[PDB]
């Protein structure tokens, strides 16, 4: 704003200003192994 009257005058200015950011990451890895070996398969007592 600027104002002048007669001599006299006044003036002004503004900035409000703002910012925001975010990040996320997520990771998961799950492994199973089940294994059997035999070399005699019926052993019978």
């Amino acid at each position: 704003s600027s104002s002048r009257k007669r001599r006299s005058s006044s003036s002004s200015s503004r900035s409000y200003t703002s910012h925001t950011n975010e990040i996320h990451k997520g990771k998961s890895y799950q492994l199973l192994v089940v294994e059997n070996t035999v070399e005699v398969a019926q052993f019978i007592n």
């Binding site: 704003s1 600027s2 104002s3 002048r4 009257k5 007669r6 070996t37 035999v38 070399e39």
Partner: protein, 41 residues
């Protein structure tokens, strides 16, 4: 004489970025016969 001039101004902005991936594997295997060295292999 009197004079007055005035203004107001406004602005906004946004940005977004996204990624996801998923994987799954299964294996099932039956070996019958072999030496267990290579039945293992």
């Amino acid at each position: 004489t009197k004079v007055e001039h005035r203004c107001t101004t406004n602005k906004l902005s946004e940005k977004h970025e996204g990624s996801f991936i998923q994987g799954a594997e299964k294996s099932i295997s039956l070996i019958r016969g072999g030496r267990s060295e290579y039945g293992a292999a």
